[PDB]
Amino acid sequence: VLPEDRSQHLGEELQGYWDQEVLRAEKDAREPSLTKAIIKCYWKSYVVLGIFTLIEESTRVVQPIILGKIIGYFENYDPSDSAALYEAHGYAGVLSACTLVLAILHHLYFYHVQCAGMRLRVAMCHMIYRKALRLSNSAMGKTTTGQIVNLLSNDVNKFDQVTIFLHFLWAGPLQAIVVTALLWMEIGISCLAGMAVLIILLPLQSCIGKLFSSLRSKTAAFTDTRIRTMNEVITGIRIIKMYAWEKSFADLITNLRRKEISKILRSSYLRGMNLASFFVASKIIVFVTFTTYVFLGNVITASRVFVAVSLYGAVRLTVTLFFPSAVEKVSEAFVSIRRIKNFLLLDEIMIVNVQDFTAFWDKASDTPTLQSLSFTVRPGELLAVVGPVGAGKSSLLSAVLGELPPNQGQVSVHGRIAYVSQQPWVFSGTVRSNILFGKKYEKERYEKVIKACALKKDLQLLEDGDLTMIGDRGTTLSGGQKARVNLARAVYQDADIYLLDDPLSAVDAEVSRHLFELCICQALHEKIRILVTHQLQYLKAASQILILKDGQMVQKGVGFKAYKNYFTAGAHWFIIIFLILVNLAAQVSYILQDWWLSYWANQQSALNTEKLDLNWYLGIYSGLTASTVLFGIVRSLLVFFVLVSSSQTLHNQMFESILRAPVLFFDRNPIGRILNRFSKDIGHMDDLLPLTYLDFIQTFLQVIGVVGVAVAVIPWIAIPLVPLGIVFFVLRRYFPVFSHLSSSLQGLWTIRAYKAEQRFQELFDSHQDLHSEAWFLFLTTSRWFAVRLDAICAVFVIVVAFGSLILAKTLDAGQVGLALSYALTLMGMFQWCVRQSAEVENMMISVERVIEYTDLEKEAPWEYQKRPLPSWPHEGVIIFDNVNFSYSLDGPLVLKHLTALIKSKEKVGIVGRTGAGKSSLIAALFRLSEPEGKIWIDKILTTEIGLHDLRKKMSIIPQEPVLFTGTMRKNLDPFNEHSDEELWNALEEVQLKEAIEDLPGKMDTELAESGSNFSVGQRQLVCLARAILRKNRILIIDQATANVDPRTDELIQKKIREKFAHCTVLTIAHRLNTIIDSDKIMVLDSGRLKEYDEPYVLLQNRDSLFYKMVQQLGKAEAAALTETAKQVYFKRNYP
Ligand SMILES: CCCCCCCCCCCCCCCCCCCC(=O)O[C@H](COC(=O)CCCCCCCCCCCCCC)COP(=O)(O)OCCN
Ligand SMILES: Nc1ncnc2c1ncn2[C@@H]1O[C@H](COP(=O)(O)OP(=O)(O)OP(=O)(O)O)[C@@H](O)[C@H]1O
Ligand SMILES: Nc1ncnc2c1ncn2[C@@H]1O[C@H](COP(=O)(O)OP(=O)(O)OP(=O)(O)O)[C@@H](O)[C@H]1O
Ligand SMILES: [Mg+2]
Ligand SMILES: [Mg+2]
């Protein structure tokens, strides 16, 4: 691609014009206008293209007048007049030349208009992503990932369209008055009856633009919420599967898709009426006129009638097709412009020192989120930030980071920030790539980071080392691995100010102090550090400590199978056969109406007072017209019905297939690869493909009509038609960005912290330039074929023109008028037919990409033919018998020979280093991959019942808390199976009631994207609230309180003891104080169960792993734990 067409030279041009308009609007006291910016940018390039229009359009309108001179040779033909035949060969010559001129002008126009659109689309995409990197937290509340995907996927694709047709808004009306002027000299006042139709149709067609834009806007809304819901399914699929919530999301998507389709059906009918107009309007017009002509007392004769029909034919495209499509495309596009505009207008964002600082995350809040803060920290000092869940600790880092601006007071910072976010940010690549983050590789400093971040061991267990591939969100890594990678990245950048948001809570006690001592103290020793932490064990190493409570400071110290499927998915084969019949019936009645004028002309020519019975000729002419109109309407609406019904059916199968795909599918496919189907491809199948099919079907049958008429009038045309057909056969025989966007929006504060924004912009522009080469290669190959197909068509028009004059002794004037009027329409229709063919064939790739996702590999059936009795589980015994587990068949085993019994009502702790396989045990139990060996739950094999039979009966609290966009009520109870008093009881028991009663909607409060209103500790408490509302014998807890402070933890621990007393409970926990009272503790290393015994019995073996683990916490910690273990063990031995 030339530099002038690159995504970063584009985009920067239009951003300049946008900024100028924004700057002028404030001087004008206006609101800015994006249309205006577009115009100012492009106009000089685009208005010139109208020259092509003007030349072509003028050349079309003279051809009928030349046709009148040759028809007027057959009419009153004298075979003596060799001089007249020589002149007639002259006029056929000029038609041959005009045909070639029109052919080159069509390609020159259509190429450039396409390019124009591509430019506009590419420039817009750049500006949208540039804006996304600048959005404030306020703006990120007013928009969502699904909207931005929608913007970049479907809204900007309107820009491809606009540029095509836009010159026809004046060429249409202009042609309509020119043809009328012309017609006046052929048929007199009678032509006025034709203008009487156009002065109706064209204003009606234009005035309908308000419908298109209102329908579009309405549609657009539902696409945003649908794509957003797909995004939170695809990123939430593990938690959705473990909860068995698939049916709730299916109902929600189905209703949004139903609302959305109701507007697509409306619009499609409008669209369909336009293409019916293209077919029938000309027939209406010539009927109206010639009825008037015969009522005023003229008689039908070949030269006047067929020049008039040909005149209409010369305008037909421009007026009847191109003009309405223009209004359509433009009124549709102004919505895209308004959508984009609104986006573009959204809000945009050595020492550390803070003074008098007060700030609000939302100005509607009654209370500040930080109040009267002052502190300062300087090189070599470590400041610990301590306090409850929701106290403001991450808010403090966001104040230093500049993401929460002061309402009063001030902040000043000098030096580069390194930000270690509370949720780890990990993106697709190798784990080496995630650590380097654009810095050069240098072995000595890199290996020092790998050991300092406690990461050397894990990388030696992996087969491909630090070059192992990682998924779009790190879903292939355990929690404490994605934490260590997130910290190792920060160390490698060698920044000046480190902002550490609870980096240690996802790792084991040994790895925790390894990171603190070797990374946070020793490696970063010379640097400013602010450490948000609950690990009170380390605070003695801090230079100063800040305690926050309640927001304030407390203290400081294409195959045919695809085509077959696409049509047959829409309707039963009877409707498809009927649809074929009305297509043929429309085109046959179309031809017979024009043959009837040819026949009427010949009868009038045969007469001598004698006159034709007008009741017969005008009667039959009326019938054939009404027949053509009737089938034209039915044919146009029925195609839209079948193909939208096909898109609706193929979507449902694709979505059902996705919900039954195994989690391995989502680990191996990028999120953007999936959203591309549901956003872009479904968009084309709904909006654009049905229209383009009907347009091709109409024009293709019209082309066949020309060849049929030409051969039927002049049989010897069949001789050259064989070579032309052979050449036609010879030619035919010879002839992701959304994952990057999603990653960028997740990492946005960290990307801004390191000032990586330019490098991220360059990646986006590089990706757009790749798609641009694919677009230019498609255009270049399509043009190469099109310019040769036109050479076949041009020869056909030439041999029918001259063949008429060679064979003239066999012809009659009405017959030549018929054959050549059709021939003159051929090439303009033939060109558009070939264009719409190429776009259909291109868009069928979208259909294949959708069909392949209808046929994904399936996770096992949700209900088998065998089902457990409703009493099951009735004891909650779980037996693991020689279990082995791997997340893929081609991959390593992560659990080996695992063999254990869990008794009824037993409480079991699960313990061991990061990456040991602890959460892998839950994935086996839930059959997220199918285990080897055997697992028995109350004497039923988990593998002999359906995936909802077991998953519904096991409560889970996952390692990652996921909340969904919606009400707080729906996040607790999506099925509406509980009363509000039960939800409030849950919210009291998880210490969260006051935090919800402060919200203005209370439980009807709408949560932001991914639950962003809440701190991470609060999102953990909501997952415990979900699990309290379910009622099951078996509960699984995975690190459910790791981000919850100790004084909140001891309360929810007490409630867990009280509420789940009758359950069998499995608890994975690094925070050993939460599990020291277990009945038995499993200790895992390297995927093996090494110890499984009573807590005190483990600790009295000084060579055990568990004795080492409690001892690593420190002497007072080990004393408290060993005492607690001894006490519970003695109490178990007293009875
Ligand atoms: C013998 C035939 C004689 C008549 C031929 C002309 C037909 C029009 C006659 C005027 C009376 C009929 C109604 C006119 C429109 C009324 C206002 C509603 C417009 C509307 O709903 O649709 C518009 C679509 O474009 C349009 O509707 C565009 C219509 C353009 C008409 C001709 C303009 C000539 C100049 C073109 C210059 C092009 C230069 C290109 C380089 C804009 O949609 P919206 O309102 O929803 O959008 C913003 C949403 N927020
Ligand atoms: N992006 C946000 N938008 C609006 N409110 C927020 C946002 N993030 C946090 N809050 C609110 O600000 C207050 C403090 O949240 P904050 O995240 O600072 O708590 P925290 O100290 O990080 O708790 P944790 O220990 O779980 O990290 C809470 O009331 C929380 O609901
Ligand atoms: N989706 C996955 N696909 C393939 N392998 C995975 C996947 N998730 C985790 N692993 C591998 O599984 C092993 C164990 O991961 P697991 O989550 O069971 O460790 P863990 O005990 O939960 O560590 P943590 O204390 O951080 O929770 C890891 O070493 C990792 O290599
Ligand atoms: Mg926090
Ligand atoms: Mg885990």
Secondary structure class of 440 (helix, strand, coil): coil
Task: Give the separation between CA 1012 and CA 1005, rounded to whole angstroms.
Answer: 13
Q: How close is the Cα of 894 to the center of ligand 3, in Å? A: 8
Dihedral over alpha carbons 1006, 1007, 1008, 1013 (to 10 degrees)? 130
The closest ligand to the CA of 921 turns out to be 3
490 within 8 A of 419, measured Cβ to Cβ: yes
Helix axes 980-989, 1016-1029, angle to 10 degrees: 130
187 within 8 A of 293, measured Cβ to Cβ: yes
Q: Which two tokens stand for residue 561?
A: 């199978």
Q: How close is the Cα of 1019 to the center of ligand 5, in Å? A: 17
Query: CB of 920 closer than 6 A to ligand 3?
Result: yes
Residue 954 is which amino acid?
M
CB atoms within 10 A of CB 221: 16
Q: Phi, psi at residue 249, to the nearest 5°?
A: -65, -35
Cβ-count burial 606-642 (b if 16+ within 10 Å, e if not): eeeeeebeeeebbeebeebbebbbebbbbbbbbbbbb
CB atoms within 10 A of CB 475: 17
Task: Give the separation between CA 456 and CA 433, rounded to whole angstroms.
Answer: 16
The closest ligand to the CA of 181 turns out to be 1
Query: CB of 173 closer than 6 A to ligand 1?
Result: yes
Q: Which two tokens stand for residue 567?
A: 């049509």
Task: Give the separation between CA 592 and CA 766, rounded to whole angstroms.
Answer: 56
Q: How close is the Cα of 1006 to the center of ligand 2, in Å? A: 16
1064 within 8 A of 1033, measured Cβ to Cβ: yes
Query: CB of 47 closer than 6 A to ligand 1?
Result: yes
SS (H, E, C) 955-990: EEECCCCCCCCCEHHHHHCCCCCCCHHHHHHHHHHC
Task: Give the separation between CA 692 and CA 631, rounded to whole angstroms.
Answer: 19
Task: Give the separation between CA 411 and CA 428, rounded to whole angstroms.
Answer: 35
884 within 8 A of 933, measured Cβ to Cβ: yes
> DSSP code of 551?
T
The experimental technique used to determine this model is cryo-EM
Environment class of 28 (CB within 10 Å of its CB; exposed 0-12, middle 13-18, buried 19+): exposed
The closest ligand to the CA of 459 turns out to be 3
Q: How close is the Cα of 971 to the center of ligand 4, in Å? A: 21
Query: CB of 917 closer than 6 A to ligand 3?
Result: yes
600 within 8 A of 617, measured Cβ to Cβ: yes
Task: Give the separation between CA 711 and CA 931, rounded to whole angstroms.
Answer: 71
Query: CB of 1125 closer than 6 A to ligand 1?
Result: no
> DSSP code of 536?
G
Residue 545 is which amino acid?
I
186 within 8 A of 69, measured Cβ to Cβ: no
Helices and strands counted in the chain (H then E) = 41, 21
Secondary structure class of 670 (helix, strand, coil): coil
The closest ligand to the CA of 1042 turns out to be 2
The closest ligand to the CA of 393 turns out to be 2
What is the residue with the minimal CA distance to atom 24 of ligand 1? 331
The closest ligand to the CA of 1044 turns out to be 2
Query: CB of 213 closer than 6 A to ligand 1?
Result: yes
Q: How close is the Cα of 501 to the center of ligand 3, in Å? A: 23
671 within 8 A of 738, measured Cβ to Cβ: yes
What ligand 3 atom has the least distance to the C-alpha of 918?
21
Task: Give the separation between CA 841 and CA 298, rounded to whole angstroms.
Answer: 49
CA 625 to chain centroid = 45
Closest residue by Cα to residue 1019 from 151, 484, 423, 401: 423
Task: Give the separation between CA 526 and CA 522, rounded to whole angstroms.
Answer: 9
Any bridge partners for residue 552, and if so which? 371, 549
570 within 8 A of 642, measured Cβ to Cβ: yes
Q: How close is the Cα of 293 to the center of ligand 1, in Å? A: 33
Secondary structure class of 524 (helix, strand, coil): coil
Find the angle CA(27)-CA(29)-CA(32) to the nearest 5 degrees: 90
Query: CB of 333 closer than 6 A to ligand 1?
Result: no
What ligand 2 atom has the least distance to the C-alpha of 137?
1
**Residue position matching structure tokens 């550390």:** 352
What residue ranges in 752-802 does DSSP mark as E strands? none
854 within 8 A of 860, measured Cβ to Cβ: no
Distances from the Cα of 639 to the Cα of 277, 517, 574, 695, 698, angstroms: 15, 71, 14, 10, 11
Query: CB of 338 closer than 6 A to ligand 1?
Result: yes
What ligand 3 atom has the least distance to the C-alpha of 915?
19
Query: CB of 1033 closer than 6 A to ligand 3?
Result: no
CB atoms within 10 A of CB 560: 7
Q: How close is the Cα of 409 to the center of ligand 4, in Å? A: 22
Q: Which two tokens stand for residue 788?
A: 């040769």
Find the angle CA(17)-CA(22)-CA(28) to the nearest 5 degrees: 120
648 within 8 A of 449, measured Cβ to Cβ: no
Helices of type H across 747-756: 748-753
Looking only at the bridges linking them, the beta strands covering 469-470 and 429-430 are: antiparallel
Of 175, 331, 336, 338, which is best to mutate to test ligand 1, by the most ligand atoms within 8 angstroms of its C-beta?
Answer: 331
141 within 8 A of 353, measured Cβ to Cβ: no
Q: How close is the Cα of 16 to the center of ligand 3, in Å? A: 49
Residue 626 is which amino acid?
A
What ligand 3 atom has the least distance to the C-alpha of 475?
1
DSSP structure string for 232-274: HHHHHHHHHHHHT-HHHHHHHHHHHHHHHHHHHHHHHHHHHHH
What ligand 1 atom has the least distance to the C-alpha of 213?
46
CB atoms within 10 A of CB 438: 10
Looking only at the bridges linking them, the beta strands covering 1034-1038 and 954-957 are: parallel
Query: CB of 476 closer than 6 A to ligand 3?
Result: yes
Closest residue by Cα to residue 969 from 984, 953, 954: 984
Secondary structure class of 319 (helix, strand, coil): helix
Residue 265 is which amino acid?
L
Task: Give the separation between CA 160 and CA 114, rounded to whole angstroms.
Answer: 7
Q: Which two tokens stand for residue 111?
A: 């190429």
- 523 CB-near residues (< 8 Å, 6+ apart): 448, 449, 452, 491
Ligand 2 — pocket residues by CB below 6 A? 137, 361-362, 369, 389-395, 422, 1012-1017, 1043
Task: Give the separation between CA 143 and CA 126, rounded to whole angstroms.
Answer: 18
Task: Give the separation between CA 1070 and CA 1084, rounded to whole angstroms.
Answer: 12
**Residue position matching structure tokens 């948000």:** 532
Radius of gyration, alpha carbons of the chain: 37
Helices of type H across 47-167: 50-74, 82-134, 139-142, 145-150, 159-165
Task: Give the separation between CA 393 and CA 1071, rounded to whole angstroms.
Answer: 21
The closest ligand to the CA of 477 turns out to be 3
Task: Using a CB cutoff of 5 Å, list residues around ligand 4, an ion.
Answer: 394, 422, 1015
What is the residue with the minimal CA distance to atom 24 of ligand 3? 914
Q: How close is the Cα of 1067 to the center of ligand 3, in Å? A: 16
CA-based torsion, 375, 379, 382, 384: positive or negative:
positive
